[PDB]
């Protein structure tokens, strides 16, 4: 079939990337809710 | 109990019991059903009741002679072996020395 | 350290000039099969460290 | 401030080798000192052909605690428990029993 995950790096870095988390002020709180619980995979940039 | 209020699974359907949380107080790593808070324990007893208790305790020590009376008892140097050997040759074992 | 502790910077110019090359010869013999001693590297690195310390002061 | 050091003649207080005498060889600050010829424990070396380690049994000394031994002063021939004092501007250790300054 045509399954759910169809992978693309140039879409993933623009959707769930760090510079995607950049401009949205409601996303700065998301980064500040991952740093302040201390995860290793902060965002899915590589 | 740190997690979230999400169910494990939906209620009806698969053949198990109606689970409710990952903080379930009958589960492993669950909660405690009647956990108690940081509290106090001091009761209150009266002025009259406390002084009556003191007058009650000041009687069997007389009737059993575990209270003894001495006028002067001290030492003239800050040294503990002097009181140790004073109690030694006074021949007492467990003393409560109340000064004036 | 007490030799270099007084020294002038014009000495340190030629001293660094030979010193980095002595570190390089030392490390290329650490690469090849002649150096069987394992302390001169740690010597020469702190040797460059102790003069790069004083190069700010003078 | 080391009450027992690396190059002294020391007596074992208690344990298996109580009362016996011997010299310390070298020292570890985890609370263990090598004292020579005291506790001969077994070891079974594995024979490797590298560096010519042929194996065989080796009876080696065992390390032992600093707080299980005390110094062996020939001025008493007994248990001397070292103290400290200052002479001539340096820490000099003396003997708290029989009052001999170690020099």
């Amino acid at each position: 079939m045509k399954r759910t995950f169809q992978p693309s790096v140039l879409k993933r870095n623009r959707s769930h990337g760090f510079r995607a988390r950049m401009a949205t002020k409601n996303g700065r709180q998301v980064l500040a809710r991952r740093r302040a619980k201390g995860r290793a995979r902060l965002t899915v940039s590589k | 109990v740190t997690g979230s209020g999400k169910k494990p699974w939906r209620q009806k359907g698969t053949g198990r019991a109606r689970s409710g949380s990952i903080k379930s107080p009958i589960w492993r790593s669950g909660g405690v059903t009647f956990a108690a808070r940081p509290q106090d324990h001091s009761q209150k007893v009266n002025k009259k009741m406390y002084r009556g208790a003191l007058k009650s305790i000041l009687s069997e020590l007389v009737r059993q002679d575990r209270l003894i009376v001495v006028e002067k008892f001290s030492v003239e140097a800050p040294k503990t072996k002097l009181l140790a050997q004073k109690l030694k040759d006074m021949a007492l074992e467990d003393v409560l020395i109340i000064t004036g | 350290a007490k030799e270099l502790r007084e020294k002038s910077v014009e000495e340190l110019n030629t001293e660094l000039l030979n010193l980095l090359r002595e570190q390089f010869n030392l490390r290329m013999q650490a690469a090849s099969g002649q150096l069987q001693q394992s302390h001169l590297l740690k010597q020469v690195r702190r040797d460059v460290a102790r003069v790069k310390t004083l190069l700010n002061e003078k | 401030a080391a009450k027992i050091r690396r190059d002294d003649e020391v007596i074992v207080l208690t344990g298996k080798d109580k009362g016996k005498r011997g010299k310390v060889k070298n020292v570890l600050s985890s609370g263990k000192v090598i004292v020579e010829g005291i506790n001969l424990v077994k070891k079974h070396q594995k024979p490797v052909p590298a560096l010519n380690q042929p194996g065989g049994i080796v009876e080696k000394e065992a390390a032992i605690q600093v707080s299980n031994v005390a110094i062996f002063n020939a001025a008493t021939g007994k248990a001397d428990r070292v103290g400290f004092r200052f002479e001539d501007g340096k820490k000099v250790r003396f003997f708290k029993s029989n009052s001999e300054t170690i020099k």
């Binding site: - | - | 000039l17 980095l20 090359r21 290329m28 690469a31 090849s32 | -």
Partner: protein, 94 residues
């Protein structure tokens, strides 16, 4: 011009391989494991001035290191640059 601190700090080792010896013996080429921040206009300017060898071209690349499974730990080695550097005709380094 290029300064002697970089000129001395840029090389790291000569490499050894069954692949390396063939380019040694056929084409008068050296096989250098170099640091990662090396450029072709600088490796040549180091080995020309220092070792007194006539050189013209450098063919860089990057070897990437593998993942080695240390029991219940996992680890991956480091980026290190290689360089196949062909010397001009008439020099043999010892």
């Amino acid at each position: 011009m290029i300064r002697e601190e970089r000129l001395l700090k840029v090389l790291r080792a000569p490499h050894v391989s069954e692949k390396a010896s063939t380019a040694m013996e056929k084409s008068n080429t050296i096989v250098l494991k170099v640091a990662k921040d090396a450029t072709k206009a600088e490796i040549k300017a180091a080995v020309q001035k220092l070792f007194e060898v006539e050189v013209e071209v450098v063919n860089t690349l990057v070897v990437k290191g593998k993942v080695k499974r240390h029991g219940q730990r996992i680890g991956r080695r480091s980026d290190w640059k290689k360089a196949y550097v062909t010397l001009k005709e008439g020099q043999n380094l010892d």
